[PDB]
Design a protein around this ligand. Structure first.
Ligand SMILES: *[C@@](C)(CO)CCOP(=O)(O)OP(=O)(O)O
Ligand SMILES: *[C@@](C)(CO)CCOP(=O)(O)OP(=O)(O)O
Ligand SMILES: [Mg+2]
Ligand SMILES: [Mg+2]
Ligand SMILES: [Mn+2]
Ligand SMILES: [Mn+2]
Lengths: 180, 176
């Protein structure tokens, strides 16, 4: 795998192997983030595997990843949902297109990303990939937002930032509707 | 270092080496749990090291451990506060003396304990042992209870159960 490198104005300049790209010195690159809801409208929260290079063992939103060369961001969402979670989804909706952030993890690994955010519904059962996700929960969005307000340090920082954006949060709410 | 095996009448029957004791088939043994506050009354929440055999990487109450043969519960707390957090404390106070639980961690490791719970105040600065603790936060007890109440899965199951016991929570709250 690789990442797509971006310059200061967020324009692509090339690619780098994925492991080598995440270090204490991470250059800006492209990513995506997605929030998944089941038919009942519950949000899927996940726990990153202990083997993940960045934020291992941390609770976070449904799925995070890196678009590969030739791939649309929405196609990367679909792929990682299948790879990490075994799960089929509805077409991802853009919910926070201009999200961008930089953060250092507990052992000093940096993430530095232009990271558009999406939401979607699951249309199949989960098949969790233990190489990527060690735990998960279906819950009510409102409860997650209250937890995020009370103890933000217990979640990944990108989860918290995305959840605290007003318009993003409105879309998450929309997805809490029960659907048949 | 060991754990103390307990029968149905809660009597020690023997010991097992501590690491070898915690498996997918963990048998009942003695432990303690402790909640630490500073002089200002802020609660210390800690995140277990990724190397811990049970619930690695998990946010939980201040300090947890295993009393040894012939050791008082209060002395075990003090010992682990020094070992894990390099911190001195006031005499531990009982908060939930009859707590007991069993739970399974994401990789299948079980804790199965008789685990009385205590509270204390720190009387020195932390000095972190990174073999035990990978992160920590000083916060307001009110906010931690709301977090436990809203997203209990973000915390260790034993922390949740202690905090959701009606009397334990009163005494934690009264404590600062
Ligand atoms: C999000 C913002 C987290 O850093 C993008 C990266 O997610 P990761 O899950 O860490 O990347 P992948 O390993 O490609 O899945
Ligand atoms: C607490 C309730 C966890 O089950 C008792 C044991 O805590 P640990 O922190 O895991 O024990 P030690 O490694 O002895 O410190
Ligand atoms: Mg990922
Ligand atoms: Mg301990
Ligand atoms: Mn990245
Ligand atoms: Mn134990």
């Amino acid at each position: 795998e690789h990442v797509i490198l971006l310059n200061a104005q967020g324009v692509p300049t090339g690619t780098l192997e994925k492991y080598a790209a995440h270090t204490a010195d991470t250059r800006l690159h492209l990513a995506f983030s997605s929030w998944l809801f089941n038919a009942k409208g519950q949000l899927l929260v996940t726990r990153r595997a202990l083997s993940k290079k960045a934020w291992p063992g941390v609770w976070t939103n449904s799925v995070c990843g890196h678009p590969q060369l030739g791939e649309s961001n929405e196609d990367a969402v679909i792929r990682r949902c299948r790879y990490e979670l075994g799960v089929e989804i509805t077409p991802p909706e853009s919910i926070y297109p201009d999200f961008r952030y930089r953060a250092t993890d507990p052992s000093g690994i940096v993430e530095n990303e232009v990271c558009p955010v999406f939401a979607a519904r699951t249309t199949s059962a989960l098949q969790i990939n233990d190489d990527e996700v060690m735990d998960y929960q279906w819950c009510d969005l409102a409860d997650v937002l209250h937890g995020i307000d009370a103890t933000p340090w217990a979640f990944s920082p990108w989860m918290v930032m995305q959840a605290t954006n007003r318009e993003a949060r409105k879309r998450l709410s929309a997805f809490t509707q029960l659907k048949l």
